Amino acid sequence: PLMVEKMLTEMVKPSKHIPQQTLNLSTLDNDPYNEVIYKACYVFKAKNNRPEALLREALSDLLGYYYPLSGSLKRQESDRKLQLSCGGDGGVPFTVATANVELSSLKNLENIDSDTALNFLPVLHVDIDGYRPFALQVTKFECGGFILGMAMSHAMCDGYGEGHIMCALTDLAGGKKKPMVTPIWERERLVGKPEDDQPPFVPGDDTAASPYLPTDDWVTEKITIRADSIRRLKEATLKEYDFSNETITTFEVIGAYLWKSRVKALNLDRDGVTVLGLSVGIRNVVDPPLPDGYYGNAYIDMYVPLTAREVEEFTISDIVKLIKEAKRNAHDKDYLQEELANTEKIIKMNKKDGLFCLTDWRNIGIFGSMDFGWDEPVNIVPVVPSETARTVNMFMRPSRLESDMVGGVQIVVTLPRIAMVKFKEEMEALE
Amino acid sequence: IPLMVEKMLTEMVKPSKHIPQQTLNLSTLDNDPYNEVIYKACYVFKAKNNRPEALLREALSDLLGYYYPLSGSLKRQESDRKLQLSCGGDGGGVPFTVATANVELSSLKNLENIDSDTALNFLPVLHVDIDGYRPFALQVTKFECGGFILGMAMSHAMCDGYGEGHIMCALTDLAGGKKKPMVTPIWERERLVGKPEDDQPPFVPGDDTAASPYLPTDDWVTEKITIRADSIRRLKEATLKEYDFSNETITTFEVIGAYLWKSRVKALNLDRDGVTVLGLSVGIRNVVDPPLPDGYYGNAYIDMYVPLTAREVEEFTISDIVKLIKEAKRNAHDKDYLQEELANTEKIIKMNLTIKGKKDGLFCLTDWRNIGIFGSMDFGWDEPVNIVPVVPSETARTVNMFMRPSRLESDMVGGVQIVVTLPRIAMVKFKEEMEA
């Protein structure tokens, strides 16, 4: 009989005056495919000064550095580009909630239904001036433990930026006076052309159709692939083809395996083209590379097109080859600028059954310490945006308390109930 | 009373041979920042029936014609966080210290129960300078009896125990009148270089472990636990009667390591819901293809980790933990596994990420029983009466080290000695568990 009740929502402003300014964003930031809300729960165990008072104070100091987080995002009808008005002005919503259970009856969110996870996550405050891109919630439990939930405009940051923001927040909450990385803006370094005569590539357009779609009985489950299974899939993949000098990554073999199993589960039109989308960091593709204080979107999506027949008939090694080549092309500066141009064309001009995007958030907890008194979250659960979940499979790391899953990977999959049944059975073949 | 060691001189011993002037790269295993610790060991020699200090200085000078990187300077860039070793420049050489003690070897009982702080009186410090530090240093402490302690210090970034043993044996081979080291040494640290995976986030095992209610404390004690061969034999038999181990035999390292883990979880009273991690090292000399030649003295092992909850460690049988320890060893012996472990270390080095997490439940086993099995060390003052490895101060608190007893203790042939560093309260409980 779980009931989570919000007690309060305050608007928290920067601890120092910010001159009124209007900021522009990068081409990657303005990508209307990226106007989704990232969400993550940080689960803290009880202790042997209340956490919400410490975090609220740190948030106000955090906005001294990350003051664009306190502004308002709005897309201009002239540009169809985003504008961020900060300073004087604003503030980040901060919600405190209580739950009528102990943390342990939720297993530290190790198996949380992603709908149920919404009870611990804030939403973005929307207004005349647009929406504030950042929001925080603290849900206190009867054990004395608590969950720190966060929402963040994906137009504002990627996971790298999200990770530094949250760690800076807990660093300040723990007594540090400065964050360890100073944030920069510099979003004009990722600004594209666009090209007047070139029709843009739109991902998911004209992809293979599924006999099960459209439906509205979609289910989200979290699938676990153990380090044992990952090695044996790598071992077998290396025997089909020695990649010689090069090593094959877990993201590559699992990604290819998810693609195959998804195509078969959705029974995609074998003559139709299916498209694997993968994100590739480009922090070091620009010259000079972006500093660590850069927290805007700093990746581009690569796409591997195959027929559903090809995906179903190719070996795993055959697909890894294409995946590896997709990542190599991402590392060319001249390709990056034509990706940027393509995005800008999509913006300036203003279904996908049939399009499969892999997302990687295993690194959500590596960018610094989150200890500010209650010792390093016992679990970090990223929650896939409702806007994209049907297209997305997300790689995430297990709880640090799950000793039997050390070195394993968890994949959040969203499929029609029919397809999901056949999808789990294909994944069984990994063990 | 008290013990007083007086250093008489330190000179930089240079090679008796011309050596190349190079800036050498190190392997991925060598560049691991967790490996930048200083190995130390005391080699005790009794009096003949003065001379030995001078003979080892000449020997060291001849040794550096072969292991000439040892005379270089170690300095890690901040460009790529990689260590570089610069040899053959001006002012190179190995620090070589001669000291005297105001007591006879008899009164320290050949270092058989030496306190680790006392033992530091016989070990050199590593020479630091604007150009970094030398990886290697020697100290000969002369005693009133006529015997002497050969103390050595060795950066783990330079070698593992296999290379350390070959260097010390080459040093005494030379001092004994031989002209060549019996094994020709090679550098080729390029053989063990990882290729970091662009899309693979770094994985640091055992970074965040179960809490101990005794930590943090300043009240740490180090003690040497002795296990005679017949208790080892009795524990092995009992472990065989829990699980039919096939024709797999169970090793002393596995079964005692498992018992050490259980006892340590109990001694430290770790949060039973938390995760405790057992680390062990697995040589990979023959895992790489081509295999490593015997003259390779760089780091040639990978660390394997067994994670469990502190409650599973207490409830599992000894045999249960042995099956897990054997499984870890099987996986380090996969060539493709070692490539990925190499890639992950490279990625850890390059990202230079913040060190975080509770290390209370991290338990790392080292094995230095093999320190004196690579050759003779007679030159001639007769085969050392004792070889005492000293745990790096940087790792002592999460490390238990296996060592062989002195060669003068007949009652302990087949026996094992374990060096244990725990909070004082935990050491009490720990010694009680060791009593069985």
Short mmCIF file of N, CA and C in Angstrom, two decimals, chain B residues 243-333:
data_model
loop_
_atom_site.label_atom_id
_atom_site.label_comp_id
_atom_site.label_asym_id
_atom_site.label_seq_id
_atom_site.Cartn_x
_atom_site.Cartn_y
_atom_site.Cartn_z
N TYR B 243 32.93 -31.05 -0.01
CA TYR B 243 32.64 -30.98 -1.44
C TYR B 243 33.66 -31.84 -2.16
N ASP B 244 33.17 -32.76 -2.98
CA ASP B 244 34.06 -33.63 -3.74
C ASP B 244 34.81 -32.78 -4.76
N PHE B 245 36.06 -32.44 -4.44
CA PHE B 245 36.88 -31.69 -5.38
C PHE B 245 37.55 -32.59 -6.42
N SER B 246 36.78 -33.52 -7.00
CA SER B 246 37.12 -34.10 -8.29
C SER B 246 38.47 -34.82 -8.30
N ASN B 247 39.38 -34.34 -9.15
CA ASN B 247 40.80 -34.54 -8.92
C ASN B 247 41.49 -33.18 -8.89
N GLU B 248 40.72 -32.09 -8.88
CA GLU B 248 41.27 -30.81 -8.49
C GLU B 248 41.77 -30.89 -7.06
N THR B 249 43.01 -30.51 -6.85
CA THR B 249 43.45 -30.36 -5.47
C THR B 249 43.23 -28.92 -5.03
N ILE B 250 43.15 -28.74 -3.72
CA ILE B 250 42.97 -27.42 -3.12
C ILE B 250 44.32 -26.98 -2.57
N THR B 251 44.65 -25.71 -2.78
CA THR B 251 45.96 -25.19 -2.42
C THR B 251 45.93 -24.55 -1.04
N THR B 252 47.11 -24.46 -0.44
CA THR B 252 47.26 -23.77 0.83
C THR B 252 46.80 -22.32 0.73
N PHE B 253 47.10 -21.66 -0.39
CA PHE B 253 46.70 -20.27 -0.57
C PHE B 253 45.18 -20.13 -0.60
N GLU B 254 44.49 -21.05 -1.28
CA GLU B 254 43.04 -20.94 -1.40
C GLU B 254 42.35 -21.17 -0.07
N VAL B 255 42.72 -22.24 0.64
CA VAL B 255 41.97 -22.65 1.82
C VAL B 255 42.26 -21.73 3.00
N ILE B 256 43.51 -21.30 3.15
CA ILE B 256 43.83 -20.35 4.21
C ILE B 256 43.34 -18.95 3.85
N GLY B 257 43.47 -18.56 2.58
CA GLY B 257 42.89 -17.30 2.15
C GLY B 257 41.40 -17.22 2.47
N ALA B 258 40.67 -18.31 2.18
CA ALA B 258 39.25 -18.36 2.52
C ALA B 258 39.04 -18.22 4.02
N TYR B 259 39.86 -18.90 4.83
CA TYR B 259 39.73 -18.79 6.27
C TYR B 259 40.10 -17.39 6.75
N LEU B 260 41.11 -16.77 6.14
CA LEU B 260 41.46 -15.39 6.49
C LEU B 260 40.30 -14.45 6.21
N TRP B 261 39.63 -14.63 5.07
CA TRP B 261 38.51 -13.77 4.70
C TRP B 261 37.38 -13.87 5.72
N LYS B 262 36.96 -15.09 6.04
CA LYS B 262 35.91 -15.30 7.04
C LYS B 262 36.29 -14.66 8.37
N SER B 263 37.52 -14.90 8.82
CA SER B 263 37.95 -14.38 10.12
C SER B 263 38.03 -12.86 10.10
N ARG B 264 38.43 -12.28 8.97
CA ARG B 264 38.55 -10.83 8.89
C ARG B 264 37.19 -10.16 8.90
N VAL B 265 36.21 -10.74 8.18
CA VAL B 265 34.85 -10.23 8.24
C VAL B 265 34.32 -10.27 9.67
N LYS B 266 34.65 -11.34 10.40
CA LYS B 266 34.21 -11.45 11.78
C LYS B 266 34.98 -10.49 12.68
N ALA B 267 36.30 -10.40 12.49
CA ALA B 267 37.10 -9.51 13.33
C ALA B 267 36.69 -8.06 13.13
N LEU B 268 36.62 -7.60 11.88
CA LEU B 268 36.22 -6.23 11.60
C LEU B 268 34.74 -5.99 11.82
N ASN B 269 33.95 -7.05 12.01
CA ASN B 269 32.51 -6.94 12.26
C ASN B 269 31.82 -6.12 11.17
N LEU B 270 32.08 -6.49 9.93
CA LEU B 270 31.59 -5.70 8.81
C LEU B 270 30.08 -5.83 8.66
N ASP B 271 29.44 -4.71 8.30
CA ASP B 271 28.03 -4.65 7.95
C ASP B 271 27.72 -5.89 7.11
N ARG B 272 26.82 -6.75 7.61
CA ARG B 272 26.56 -8.03 6.95
C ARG B 272 25.79 -7.80 5.66
N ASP B 273 25.10 -6.67 5.52
CA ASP B 273 24.45 -6.33 4.27
C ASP B 273 25.42 -5.77 3.24
N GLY B 274 26.58 -5.28 3.68
CA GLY B 274 27.54 -4.71 2.76
C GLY B 274 28.30 -5.76 1.98
N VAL B 275 29.03 -5.29 0.98
CA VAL B 275 29.83 -6.15 0.12
C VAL B 275 31.28 -6.10 0.58
N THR B 276 31.88 -7.27 0.78
CA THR B 276 33.31 -7.39 1.00
C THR B 276 33.94 -8.03 -0.23
N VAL B 277 35.15 -7.61 -0.56
CA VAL B 277 35.80 -8.01 -1.80
C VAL B 277 37.16 -8.62 -1.48
N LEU B 278 37.38 -9.84 -1.97
CA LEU B 278 38.66 -10.52 -1.84
C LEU B 278 39.46 -10.33 -3.12
N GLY B 279 40.66 -9.78 -3.00
CA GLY B 279 41.57 -9.65 -4.12
C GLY B 279 42.69 -10.67 -4.04
N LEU B 280 43.04 -11.23 -5.19
CA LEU B 280 44.21 -12.08 -5.31
C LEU B 280 44.88 -11.79 -6.65
N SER B 281 46.18 -12.05 -6.70
CA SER B 281 46.98 -11.81 -7.89
C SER B 281 47.23 -13.12 -8.62
N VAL B 282 47.16 -13.07 -9.95
CA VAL B 282 47.31 -14.25 -10.80
C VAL B 282 48.33 -13.93 -11.88
N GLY B 283 49.44 -14.67 -11.89
CA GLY B 283 50.45 -14.44 -12.91
C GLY B 283 49.91 -14.77 -14.29
N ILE B 284 50.38 -14.01 -15.28
CA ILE B 284 49.89 -14.16 -16.65
C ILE B 284 51.06 -14.30 -17.61
N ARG B 285 52.21 -14.75 -17.10
CA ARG B 285 53.40 -14.87 -17.95
C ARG B 285 53.14 -15.76 -19.15
N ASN B 286 52.44 -16.87 -18.95
CA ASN B 286 52.13 -17.80 -20.03
C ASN B 286 50.74 -17.58 -20.61
N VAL B 287 49.99 -16.60 -20.10
CA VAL B 287 48.68 -16.30 -20.67
C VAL B 287 48.83 -15.47 -21.94
N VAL B 288 49.70 -14.46 -21.91
CA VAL B 288 49.99 -13.70 -23.12
C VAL B 288 50.55 -14.63 -24.19
N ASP B 289 50.32 -14.26 -25.44
CA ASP B 289 50.90 -14.96 -26.59
C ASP B 289 51.59 -13.92 -27.45
N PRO B 290 52.91 -14.03 -27.68
CA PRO B 290 53.77 -15.08 -27.15
C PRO B 290 53.98 -14.95 -25.65
N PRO B 291 54.31 -16.05 -24.97
CA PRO B 291 54.53 -15.97 -23.52
C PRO B 291 55.72 -15.08 -23.19
N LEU B 292 55.78 -14.68 -21.93
CA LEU B 292 56.86 -13.82 -21.47
C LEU B 292 58.13 -14.64 -21.28
N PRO B 293 59.27 -14.17 -21.77
CA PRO B 293 60.53 -14.86 -21.47
C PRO B 293 60.95 -14.59 -20.03
N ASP B 294 61.84 -15.45 -19.54
CA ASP B 294 62.18 -15.43 -18.12
C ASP B 294 62.92 -14.16 -17.73
N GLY B 295 63.58 -13.50 -18.68
CA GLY B 295 64.26 -12.25 -18.39
C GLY B 295 63.35 -11.05 -18.27
N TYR B 296 62.06 -11.22 -18.56
CA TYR B 296 61.09 -10.15 -18.36
C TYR B 296 60.86 -9.96 -16.86
N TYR B 297 61.11 -8.75 -16.37
CA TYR B 297 60.99 -8.47 -14.94
C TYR B 297 59.95 -7.41 -14.62
N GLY B 298 59.18 -6.96 -15.60
CA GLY B 298 58.07 -6.08 -15.31
C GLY B 298 56.93 -6.81 -14.64
N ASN B 299 55.92 -6.04 -14.25
CA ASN B 299 54.71 -6.62 -13.68
C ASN B 299 54.07 -7.57 -14.68
N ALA B 300 53.77 -8.79 -14.23
CA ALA B 300 53.26 -9.84 -15.10
C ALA B 300 52.16 -10.62 -14.41
N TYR B 301 51.22 -9.90 -13.81
CA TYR B 301 50.09 -10.51 -13.13
C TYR B 301 48.90 -9.57 -13.23
N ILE B 302 47.71 -10.12 -13.03
CA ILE B 302 46.49 -9.33 -12.95
C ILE B 302 45.79 -9.64 -11.64
N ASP B 303 45.11 -8.64 -11.10
CA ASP B 303 44.37 -8.79 -9.85
C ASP B 303 42.96 -9.27 -10.15
N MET B 304 42.56 -10.36 -9.49
CA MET B 304 41.21 -10.87 -9.57
C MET B 304 40.48 -10.58 -8.26
N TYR B 305 39.18 -10.35 -8.36
CA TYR B 305 38.39 -9.94 -7.21
C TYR B 305 37.15 -10.81 -7.09
N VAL B 306 36.85 -11.22 -5.86
CA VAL B 306 35.67 -12.02 -5.57
C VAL B 306 34.75 -11.21 -4.66
N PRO B 307 33.65 -10.67 -5.19
CA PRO B 307 32.72 -9.91 -4.34
C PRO B 307 31.65 -10.80 -3.72
N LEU B 308 31.41 -10.58 -2.44
CA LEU B 308 30.35 -11.25 -1.70
C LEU B 308 29.85 -10.29 -0.64
N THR B 309 28.64 -10.55 -0.14
CA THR B 309 28.18 -9.80 1.02
C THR B 309 28.83 -10.37 2.27
N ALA B 310 29.08 -9.49 3.24
CA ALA B 310 29.74 -9.91 4.47
C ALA B 310 28.99 -11.06 5.15
N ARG B 311 27.68 -11.17 4.90
CA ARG B 311 26.91 -12.28 5.46
C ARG B 311 27.18 -13.58 4.72
N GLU B 312 27.34 -13.52 3.40
CA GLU B 312 27.66 -14.74 2.66
C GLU B 312 29.02 -15.28 3.08
N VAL B 313 29.99 -14.39 3.33
CA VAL B 313 31.32 -14.85 3.72
C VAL B 313 31.25 -15.62 5.04
N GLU B 314 30.40 -15.17 5.97
CA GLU B 314 30.30 -15.84 7.26
C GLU B 314 29.51 -17.14 7.17
N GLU B 315 28.50 -17.18 6.30
CA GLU B 315 27.68 -18.38 6.18
C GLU B 315 28.25 -19.41 5.21
N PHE B 316 28.98 -18.99 4.17
CA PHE B 316 29.52 -19.96 3.22
C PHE B 316 30.51 -20.88 3.90
N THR B 317 30.58 -22.12 3.41
CA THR B 317 31.64 -23.00 3.85
C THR B 317 32.98 -22.54 3.27
N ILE B 318 34.06 -23.06 3.86
CA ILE B 318 35.38 -22.85 3.27
C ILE B 318 35.39 -23.32 1.82
N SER B 319 34.81 -24.50 1.58
CA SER B 319 34.78 -25.03 0.22
C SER B 319 34.04 -24.07 -0.72
N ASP B 320 32.96 -23.44 -0.24
CA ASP B 320 32.24 -22.48 -1.08
C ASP B 320 33.15 -21.37 -1.59
N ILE B 321 33.96 -20.80 -0.70
CA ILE B 321 34.84 -19.71 -1.10
C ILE B 321 35.96 -20.24 -1.99
N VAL B 322 36.38 -21.49 -1.78
CA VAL B 322 37.42 -22.08 -2.61
C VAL B 322 36.94 -22.22 -4.06
N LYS B 323 35.71 -22.73 -4.26
CA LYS B 323 35.19 -22.79 -5.62
C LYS B 323 35.17 -21.42 -6.27
N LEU B 324 34.88 -20.37 -5.50
CA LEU B 324 34.88 -19.03 -6.06
C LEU B 324 36.30 -18.57 -6.36
N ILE B 325 37.25 -18.90 -5.48
CA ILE B 325 38.64 -18.51 -5.71
C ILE B 325 39.20 -19.24 -6.93
N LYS B 326 38.89 -20.53 -7.07
CA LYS B 326 39.34 -21.26 -8.25
C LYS B 326 38.73 -20.70 -9.52
N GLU B 327 37.46 -20.28 -9.46
CA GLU B 327 36.82 -19.72 -10.65
C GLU B 327 37.50 -18.43 -11.08
N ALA B 328 37.88 -17.59 -10.12
CA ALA B 328 38.61 -16.37 -10.46
C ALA B 328 39.92 -16.69 -11.16
N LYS B 329 40.62 -17.73 -10.70
CA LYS B 329 41.90 -18.09 -11.30
C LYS B 329 41.71 -18.58 -12.73
N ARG B 330 40.64 -19.34 -12.99
CA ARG B 330 40.38 -19.82 -14.35
C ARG B 330 40.18 -18.67 -15.32
N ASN B 331 39.56 -17.58 -14.86
CA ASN B 331 39.23 -16.48 -15.77
C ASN B 331 40.43 -15.59 -16.05
N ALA B 332 41.34 -15.43 -15.09
CA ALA B 332 42.58 -14.71 -15.37
C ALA B 332 43.43 -15.44 -16.40
N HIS B 333 43.21 -16.74 -16.58
CA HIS B 333 43.96 -17.55 -17.53
C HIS B 333 43.31 -17.59 -18.91
#
